Write a protein that binds this ligand. Sequence first.
Ligand code: APR
Length: 190
Amino acid sequence: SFNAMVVNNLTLQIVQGHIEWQTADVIVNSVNPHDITVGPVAKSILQQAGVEMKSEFLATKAKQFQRSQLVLVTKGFNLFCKYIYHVLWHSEFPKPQILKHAMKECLEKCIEQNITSISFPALGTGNMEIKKETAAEILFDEVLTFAKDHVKHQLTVKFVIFPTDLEIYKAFSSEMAKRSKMLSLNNYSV
Ligand SMILES: Nc1ncnc2c1ncn2[C@@H]1O[C@H](COP(=O)(O)OP(=O)(O)OC[C@H]2O[C@@H](O)[C@H](O)[C@@H]2O)[C@@H](O)[C@H]1O
């Protein structure tokens, strides 16, 4: 069994744990921009970051928010991270399409803000009801695009699967196995 792969300058690991207890430069949240207190990832991150993060979210939303915005950045506050990238769900468009755009944008922001590590939950797989295999294929696709198109930018990416979401874990681990075999990647068990 394995839970990590290395491709070019990118390390990808699947972790069973809590997104809000990660240590990384960036931790990714998943919210309704009109109420960041709804949803288990959202509540998890908010309670751990603290109420000051919500204040900053709201103030940044007032300055920046528009229909085109898919990712809003705040500081990490009491989280063990520099920034939180809040993925914003606020349209009627197909959720896998939104996911793909939001994933690419989070990774592109890693260049802009010179980020060395980023930890994602299984975005879209809860309230947004994206099929586990679809979510896995999109997340892997965008990470591998990054690894090829931004080859000089070292990055450690973690996909953090809630401990009891075993079916999601298995879908992500199956995807890792498929990509690793095809690309002859070296795998690790941590
Ligand atoms: N603390 C946690 N750490 C890691 N993963 C978690 C945690 N809590 C929940 N998860 C998992 O994260 C995934 C995403 O679930 P949601 O939090 O429901 O988020 P998502 O499916 O992306 O939908 C976001 C939507 O829900 C609310 O934020 C709001 O309505 C927003 O638009 C699911 O697999 C869920 O079980």
